Amino acid sequence: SGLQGHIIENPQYFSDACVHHIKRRDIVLKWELGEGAFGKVFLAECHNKMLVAVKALKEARQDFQREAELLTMLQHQHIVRFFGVCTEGRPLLMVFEYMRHGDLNRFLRSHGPDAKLLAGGEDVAPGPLGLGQLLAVASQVAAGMVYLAGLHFVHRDLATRNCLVGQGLVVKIGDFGMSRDIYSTDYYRVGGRTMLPIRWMPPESILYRKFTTESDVWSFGVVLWEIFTYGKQPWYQLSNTEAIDCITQGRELERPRACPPEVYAIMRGCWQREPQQRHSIKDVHARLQALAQAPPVYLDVL
Ligand SMILES: CCOc1nn(-c2ccccc2)c(NC(=O)N[C@@H]2CN(CCOC)C[C@H]2c2ccc(F)c(F)c2)c1C
Ligand code: NA
Helix, strand or coil: CCCCCCHHHCCCCCCCCCCCECCHHHEEEEEEEEEECCEEEEEEEECCCEEEEEEEECCCHHHHHHHHHHHCCCCCCCECCEEEEECCCCCCEEEEECCCCCEHHHHHHHCCCCCCCCCCCCCCCCCCCCHHHHHHHHHHHHHHHHHHHHCCCCCCCCCHHHEEEECCCEEEECCCCCHHHHCHHHCEECCCCCEECHHHCCHHHHHHCCCCHHHHHHHHHHHHHHHHCCCCCCCCCCCHHHHHHHHHHCCCCCCCCCCCHHHHHHHHHHCCCCHHHCCCHHHHHHHHHHHHCCCHHHHCCC
């Protein structure tokens, strides 16, 4: 296909992995939550009891099957969970856990220093998110990425738009395939239809279309910057081509105001020009999680 972030750009190793099929009588559509080029998302009830987000197919069918066979492989606390397919009737559905707070980018922006309401609530204290919470968000996204690297998957569109936030402030990697419709400003249109997330991409991905665990690490560095900026667009001062110009010359995003120097060093180790020089995601995870769980006395003074 060529679409960065599309799960089917990865290789299928287990061509016989089984896919769970859910009966029509076990699903009750409640209402629409959203809509893109390739589908509609609905809240539903799934029975044997629980709320689910279902993605309805628009139309493709072979892509659908390939997507379900790969998505049955992804089972991890920090990947949005895929429960199966409902193919008896229309629409064809893929069924996922429901993530109440929506996408992480919107969640950051709405709990940041420019938000309207910063009242305390179920999952968040009254101010903007504090350090320990920004660290816990980062850590969970990094943990999802350690899992993907363990299984030889490469995401290619890692960004806060492509993570979801659930109840209890649980952050998982996932999207319903509509980020180019909803956040089209984060993509650079080169083709008649190609849309590249160039502000999250390292030089080798931009120039050669090479994608590895290491270009994903670079993107994770950019995610870190988005978390510590409360969801700002990287290089927001710059047009797409200017950002390419920056990235290519080797300029680095600046330390955000809410980012301690220790955390900035982590970002920087993800942004080495040479892919083999970049930190390993297992080490980034390990450091961020250790920081998230550090004593408040230490974190208060970073
Ligand atoms: C032509 C359609 O373009 C796309 N479709 N989808 C897609 C397809 C099926 C289910 C959900 C999204 C996607 N995105 C997509 O595959 N994302 C994967 C689904 N996510 C879980 C469900 O969260 C709701 C995980 C995410 C993902 C994970 C690891 C990867 F390596 C990867 F490439 C994508 C795009 C760009
Ligand atoms: Na990548």
